[PDB]
């Protein structure tokens, strides 16, 4: 499944994920693709800051949803 | 544990706190560092305004969390 991860510069990254992936798994995939450590990543979806132990499906994130990546450091 | 406090101007304050500390304790620690009277401080975390009599643990504020400090008038 593809989702989009949008940075504050407007750059949109396409990421391959599974619909049952946890948020921590997604942060690991962003690390693998972009080189950003999970501790420096904050992900926001439709108003909410996403918590590491919950799945994408549990937030109603699906194919071609956009998550917003904020770097925190 | 250390927590951080960010103001509108970008100033960062580091405080030494225990999770059992009250919000009124945190405001008094901010006064010691910055000189702002506690009755002029408003603290925000996770979209919520923090109440003087509750504790940091009540709001799930953990090591290295960041709070936002606003001022009243």
């Amino acid at each position: 499944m593809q989702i989009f991860v949008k940075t504050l510069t407007g750059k949109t990254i396409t990421l391959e994920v599974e619909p049952s992936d946890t948020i921590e798994n997604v942060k690991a995939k962003i690390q693998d693709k972009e080189g950003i450590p999970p501790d420096q990543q904050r992900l926001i979806f439709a108003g909410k800051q996403l918590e590491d132990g919950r799945t994408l499906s549990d937030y109603n994130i699906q194919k071609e949803s956009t998550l917003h990546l904020v770097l925190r450091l | 544990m250390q927590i951080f406090v960010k103001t509108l101007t970008g100033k960062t304050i580091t405080l030494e706190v225990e999770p059992s500390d009250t919000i009124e304790n945190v405001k008094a620690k901010i006064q010691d560092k910055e000189g702002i009277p506690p009755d002029q401080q408003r603290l925000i975390f996770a979209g919520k305004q923090l109440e003087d009599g509750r504790t940091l643990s009540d709001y799930n504020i953990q090591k290295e969390s960041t709070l936002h400090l606003v001022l009243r008038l």
Binding site: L8, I44, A46, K48, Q49, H68, V70 | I44, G47
Partner: peptide, 30 residues
């Protein structure tokens, strides 16, 4: 005036006492 507000940069739902987003520091009143 007392309502929460969404950041136009990251969508986070912010408290009305903040005039910059708690997550990304984008000003509310751009």
């Amino acid at each position: 005036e007392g309502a929460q507000w969404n950041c136009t940069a990251c969508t986070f739902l912010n408290h009305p006492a903040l005039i910059r987003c708690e997550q990304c520091e984008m000003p509310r009143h751009f």
